[PDB]
A paper describes a structure:
The structures show a zig-zag arrangement of nucleosomes, with nucleosomes 1 and 3 forming a stack. H1 binding to stacked nucleosomes depends on the NRL, whereas H1 always binds to the non-stacked nucleosomes 2 and 4.
Nucleosome 4 is not stacked with nucleosome 2 and is increasingly mobile as the NRL increases. We were nevertheless able to refine the structure of nucleosome 4 as part of a tetranucleosome in the 4×177 array and also in isolation within the 4×187 array.
Residue numbers in the entry:
A (entry chain k), F (entry chain o): 37 to 133
B (entry chain s): 35 to 109
C (entry chain l), G (entry chain p): 20 to 102
D (entry chain n), I (entry chain e): 30 to 124
E (entry chain m), H (entry chain q): 10 to 118
Write the structure that this text describes.
DNA sequence: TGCCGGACCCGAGCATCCGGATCCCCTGGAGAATCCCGGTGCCGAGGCCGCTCAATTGGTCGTAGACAGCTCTAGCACCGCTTAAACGCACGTACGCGCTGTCCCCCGCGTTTTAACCGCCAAGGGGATTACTCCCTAGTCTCCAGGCACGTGTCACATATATACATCCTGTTCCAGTGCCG
DNA sequence: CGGCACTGGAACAGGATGTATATATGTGACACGTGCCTGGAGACTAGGGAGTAATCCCCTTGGCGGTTAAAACGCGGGGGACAGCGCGTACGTGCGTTTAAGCGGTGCTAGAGCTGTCTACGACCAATTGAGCGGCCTCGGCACCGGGATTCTCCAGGGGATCCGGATGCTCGGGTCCGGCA
């Protein structure tokens, strides 16, 4: 047969890979487009320093992966390996958001 | 009116004869497909299957009590 | 110029990459849209305050030092962007 | 005798009789109010201080304070506070 | 030969002492120069928030038939108002108690 | 047969009663005993405003109450009603503590 | 002169009273001593800086204003004790 | 005529410009006067913390076998020091990444 | 004509060469270090300003920073920083 | 006029229908806890008065910042490629999910204890206050040297690519339990 | 009951693939030399913020008795936590596929950013006063107390329902009714 790795092996390998790596994961251009879109909601005629945009990307990704680890340990407490957004809402509300 | 629950559970267990015994969920689905008030007689059919296990007509395959699987007797 | 649907500018496999970096093993399909809403709330907050900065700075270009202010006023402090 | 201890209890009690002419106050609730108003006063003045740092400006204007109001206040609180302070600034300008 | 001294609070027609708060700003080590209208504006918005919280607290006290405000109704006012609660999420109240919050999953059949 | 309530119902009445009430629930004299016990570990012969100790109390059981709603949310979210220390540990981690 | 055990003066009826005010319905038996240790940790966290306050304020009496500072630098802002 | 210009950092044996520190204090408007030993003490404890964190960064970099330290070395240095994690828990780091941390429940068997 | 901007990256580099002469650094890492310096500076400065404001103090001495750091620093770091700054201020005082 | 077989009416079989045993279900009995209504006595809150000290007016004056103008720079916009990832779907499996069996732990109700609280009282420890006097540091003058800008070059490091091992899954062999016949 | 065929179940081999390494090659951004100047520093002066002496009082801590409601232990039992089984779906993984971001180049400009001006507005100080603060008082709302109304909540028990077993009666076949037959 052609080989197929059993589920979880590949996922844990990418966990090791991206805990090893440091770089941004979302493509920068659609994120930038989203930044422009959100800033347009407040005021038109706005330009953007790129350093601001990468700062937003890094801060947002760090915020997300932090709450990912939080919901991860929450689902570990909840005896599951599959995350559901009820865990996310609980983490936000207990965290205070 | 219909027969007592022993009749229904005996055809529930004898409908398929899987290699492992019929599970409680599968026999519940079988009685639902054939047509019976599983909603209210659930305690009734649980004590009925407990009775048929105690009479030795039916033998529990894997679990103990209502859990696990159930199959017909040896002969 | 005019942009509409950058809600899906975050792709699902990007979220899966982040979740593997976030240590998540099994991900529901319901996760991505809820996280999209959460990140929208967070960026609306910080970018609204960044706009408040830049209009107070009377500028038509934002700076990353405004972003430094936007991260510091809840203590989400980031280094290396002109601070 | 003792040294004078300044309090907002007179001013807040005036505001109280403006909005609720009927009700009384407890001293504990008033200490809560004073701790509140001093806390939020040093809050808003602190962010105004950082704005003075970031703008490199020696003199504090109302503009910086309205900006700091959009920093602190949640939403319609901020817009209404901006409106009320705007009218108060106008009639103070006309004395 | 000096004219009659009004107060800056009277010039704004307000309750809070503009001189006191402006003195607080000057000796707060915040700036050497402070514009004239900024303490007036700050007194105005402090008056706004004070009247808002006091009005809601008085309404809450009227709900439980007492005409003297207690920290319990202060907690009830601050926590039932999402802008006020979000504004003071990190804020502790003495003898205010908590909002009565019962989970429906805890309720029996 | 003597009167006896089923379990939890009196606990529910206690929950309601205590969610209306605002008073301190610990006997305060052991609380100052603990305060002076811990205080002498940093510097001995420190005197105390009683109001200082009351502020310490109000902050203390306020933090404990908020921790307890978080603990209850953890106990429910793992499909239960009874608390265990793993709720407390998870709450301490997700609170950044 | 010394104090050796007042943490067991934290009665489990008081703990369960806070649990009921905290909304906890059913309580394990092992909860009490661990919460005692946690709150005790919180107590040293406050009173260490309170001791530092009274030392820098050059006193031997602990006042509520230093308590206000000690709660507030962790952002546990309590009203009615400041003044 | 006049004495040789001699730096206060050298007088305190230090590296960080204590004159710049004291000037930024004066423009920081923290007090209307500042004692002489205050910016010295500030500078000195800053080299202390800087030496500690750069020691940790060097440990990480020699563990990561790279000569020039990078923000990943900074992250790996700081986040295994839990004492700094009480000190700097609310701090995010640009391109630092995260600690590789896989739980045993994720591990099979 | 460019406006000279003050940064501590040269001081960070010399500190690094003090602790590790063999070790280099990236420019963004030096930006992180300067951000750290400014961050701890503003923390300790605001805290000292508040402590001056409490005890009606208008002159900041190293005693106040020593108090404020032993507040902000837990564990052995506080004791060691107090000791090192004590030696530095002491032999400065002799100087 | 008795005798013998055919048919039927009387006994048996067995199904069948409730008789009573037993399990669940809805509503009332009981109990009690809790809200609502005054009664009482009380104690802090609001009002007033007297007294102070800082807001206020008036003036000056100097400098902070708003504007005018010039410059020049990264952001912005377009575009041509251009592979990395996005998408998408399809089988597969394993993990949530949900039901149930069991068990003992902790809510509830009692008895027993006990120390918290009141409250009353003294002692005295130190905080808080005014004053005095001076050490030091902000402000000013004049002068200099390392930091920033900028230039310049060059090795730590990413990438590439070819080897070498780890490991993950899965087929394969040895071996004991069960099932059905000897 | 035993014994062997049948079946499950564990250990191991082995391959493929990612994981980790060794070295060859630009490389540009680290890294380090210099021009200058403007902030750092040396000295003088002011003059006052602050360190300490004294006080006193007052607020903190301890002690004594009593009491009582809180607390602590026994029982105990049921209900929730956990164990276990089984399953079905929803991503995991593993291919093809679309696109789209990205990189690199070109051309523009608005607008940020630096500098002269001036000018108006805030800081600082003499006069002063009136509003704000401290103490006391009186009171009236409010907390505790007491009694009943009310409402929830838990079990008792009769009714619905159902099912194994006797009753029963109609059905299913044979001594007695019934008539021809000798």
């Amino acid at each position: 047969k052609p080989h197929r790795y059993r589920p979880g092996t590949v996922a844990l390998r990418e966990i090791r890979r991206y805990q090893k790596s440091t770089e941004l994961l979302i493509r920068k251009l659609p994120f930038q487009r989203l930044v422009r879109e959100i800033a347009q909601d407040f005021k038109t005629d706005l330009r953007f320093q790129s350093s601001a945009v990468m700062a937003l990307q890094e801060a947002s990704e760090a915020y997300l992966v932090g709450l990912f680890e939080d919901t991860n340990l929450a689902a570990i407490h909840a005896k599951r390996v599959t995350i559901m957004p009820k865990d996310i809402q609980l983490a936000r509300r207990i965290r205070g958001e | 009116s219909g027969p007592p629950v022993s009749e229904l559970i005996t055809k529930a267990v004898a409908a398929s004869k899987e290699r492992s015994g019929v599970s409680l969920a599968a026999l519940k689905k079988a009685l639902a497909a054939a047509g019976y008030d599983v909603e209210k007689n659930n305690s009734r059919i649980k004590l009925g299957l407990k009775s048929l296990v105690s009479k030795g007509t039916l033998v529990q395959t894997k679990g103990t009590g209502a859990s696990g699987s159930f199959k017909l007797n040896k002969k | 110029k005019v942009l509409r649907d950058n809600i899906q500018g975050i792709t699902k496999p990007a979220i899966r990459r982040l979740a593997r970096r976030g240590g998540v093993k099994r991900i529901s399909g319901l996760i991505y849209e809820e996280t999209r809403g959460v990140l929208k709330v967070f960026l609306e907050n910080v970018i609204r305050d960044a706009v408040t900065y830049t209009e107070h700075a009377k500028r038509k270009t934002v700076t990353a030092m405004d972003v430094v202010y936007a991260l510091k006023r809840q203590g989400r402090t980031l280094y290396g962007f002109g601070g | 005798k003792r040294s004078r201890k300044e309090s907002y209890s007179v001013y807040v009690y005036k505001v109280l009789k403006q909005v609720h002419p009927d009700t009384g106050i407890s001293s504990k609730a008033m200490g809560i109010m004073n701790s509140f108003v001093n806390d939020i006063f040093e809050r808003i003045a602190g962010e105004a201080s950082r704005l003075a740092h970031y703008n490199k400006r020696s003199t504090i204007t109302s503009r910086e304070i309205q900006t700091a109001v959009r920093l602190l206040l949640p939403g319609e609180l901020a817009k209404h506070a901006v409106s009320e302070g705007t009218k108060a600034v106008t009639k103070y300008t006309s004395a | 030969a000096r004219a009659k001294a009004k107060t800056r609070s009277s010039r704004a027609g307000l309750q809070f002492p503009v001189g006191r708060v402006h003195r607080l700003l000057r000796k707060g080590n915040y700036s050497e120069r402070v514009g004239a209208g900024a303490p007036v504006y700050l007194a105005a918005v402090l008056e706004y928030l004070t009247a808002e919280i006091l009005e809601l607290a008085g309404n809450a006290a009227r709900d439980n038939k007492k005409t003297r405000i207690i920290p319990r109704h202060l907690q009830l006012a601050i926590r039932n108002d999402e802008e006020l609660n979000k504004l003071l999420g990190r804020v502790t109240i003495a003898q205010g108690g908590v909002l009565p919050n019962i989970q429906a999953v805890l309720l029996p059949k």
